Amino acid sequence: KPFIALSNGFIGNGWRQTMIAKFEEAAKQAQADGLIGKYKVVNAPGNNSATEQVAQIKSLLLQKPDALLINPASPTALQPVIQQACDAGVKVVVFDSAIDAPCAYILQNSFVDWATYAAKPVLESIGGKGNVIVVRGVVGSQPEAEMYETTKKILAEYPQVKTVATVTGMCDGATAQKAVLGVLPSVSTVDAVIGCGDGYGVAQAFATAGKPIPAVTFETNGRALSYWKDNKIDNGSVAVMSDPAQSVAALWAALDLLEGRDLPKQMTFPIVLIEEKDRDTWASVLKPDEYAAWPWTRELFRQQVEAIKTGGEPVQPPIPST
Ligand SMILES: O=C(O)[C@H](O)[C@@H](O)CO
């Protein structure tokens, strides 16, 4: 039975921890079901560092995986080892990123849509004027770079909005908290903070400074959703992120690849946008540290692939009630 290896370029935020947890739960079940024989997760430590991930992938290849799932630390640094994996007969699914690795299959989300849903409604909620802080995501990664360009583009459409600081948050609340706290004493009143699923941490910085909580971009986790409700935050705050369960979809892709099935080289799967009407539904199911994730079954995966191939309607997976 196949050996599925997963190499993850950054583990220092809760989204990535949910992404691993969902993969490991799905893999464990696949193993019990006799669909796979073995699975392994390896995380590169540090602030999204490609050099150690490349080394880790080479150590994984020595164990002869049948498929390798990769969340890449860099848009470019993994290309040679990806080709090395393919040359050794390994099926390679790059997920939660789009990179120019010709032998790999790409399974991503629309980072552009995410960045737009995080920035545009937030700027509208402050009347297209005022002061904002930009908190960047997983700097060094391809999705972060794409989203930052998108955020700047949207900001350019609102001339009366001033960026009073840019910092790096790594889509991690505590990291964002620390970086924002660092600049608050030096800046004018802040109307919004456009970040990467870090709004709970951003909010704590403002609370520590005794300043009113701006419009923020929350984590799609249980704790942020509850904070949003319990303080009845009604100030333009939003909750949108990519799907951590891209890892589970990548598992199903790998297994289909391993039995000779054809997949598109590029696949766009859906992000997780939590509009007001969906908050309580998600909050009912998510543990505090658990990020919202689509429950991909092998069948739901195949449906989405069929929609992609045929250009049909994106599958809108169901919010789990359990
Ligand atoms: O760590 C994260 O939040 C994710 O990888 C995003 O940067 C891309 O979906």
- Inter-residue contact 44 to 317 (CB < 8 Å): no
Strand partners, 167: 135
Q: How many residues does the chain have?
A: 322
Q: What are the angstrom distances between the C-alpha of 225 and each of 118, 175, 231, 242, 320?
A: 15, 19, 10, 16, 16
Query: Could you state, in order of their start, the residue ranges of all structural domains in the chain?
Result: 1-109+243-322, 110-242
Place of tokens 């848009």: 75
Q: Could you tell me the distance, in angstroms and rounded to a whole number, from the CA of residue 15 to the centre of ligand 1?
A: 7
Q: Which of 305, 253, 228, 241 is closest to 93 using CA atoms?
A: 253
Q: Indicate whether residue 15 lines ligand 1 (CB < 6 A).
A: yes
Q: Indicate whether residue 172 lines ligand 1 (CB < 6 A).
A: no
List, in order, residues 6 or more apart from 33 with CB less than 8 Å away. none
Which residue, by CA, sits nearest to atom 7 of ligand 1?
Answer: 138
Residues preceding chain discontinuities in the chain with C to N over 2.5 Å: none
Q: What are the angstrom distances between the C-alpha of 193 and each of 79, 237, 297?
A: 35, 9, 36
Angle 255-72-45 (CA atoms, 0-180°, nearest 5)? 115
**Rounded Cα–Cα distance for residues 317 and 294 (Å):** 6
Q: Indicate whether residue 143 lines ligand 1 (CB < 6 A).
A: yes
Q: How many angstroms separate the most distant Cα atoms in the chain?
A: 60
Place of tokens 């919010």: 319
The ligand 1 atom at the shortest distance from the C-alpha of residue 243 is 9
Left, alpha or beta for 3 (phi > 0: left; psi -120 to 50: alpha)?
beta
- Inter-residue contact 228 to 46 (CB < 8 Å): no
Left, alpha or beta for 211 (phi > 0: left; psi -120 to 50: alpha)?
beta
Experimental method: X-ray
Q: Which of 185, 169, 188 is closest to 177 using CA atoms?
A: 169
Which residue, by CA, sits nearest to atom 9 of ligand 1?
Answer: 242
**Rounded Cα–Cα distance for residues 171 and 189 (Å):** 23
Name the CA radius of gyration of the chain, rounded: 20
- Cα 167 versus chain centre, distance: 19
User: Which strand ranges, in their side-by-side order, compose the sheet holding 192-194?
Assistant: 161-168, 130-136, 192-194, 215-218, 238-241, 272-273
Question: Which tokens is 165 given?
Answer: 């600081």
**Rounded Cα–Cα distance for residues 100 and 191 (Å):** 38
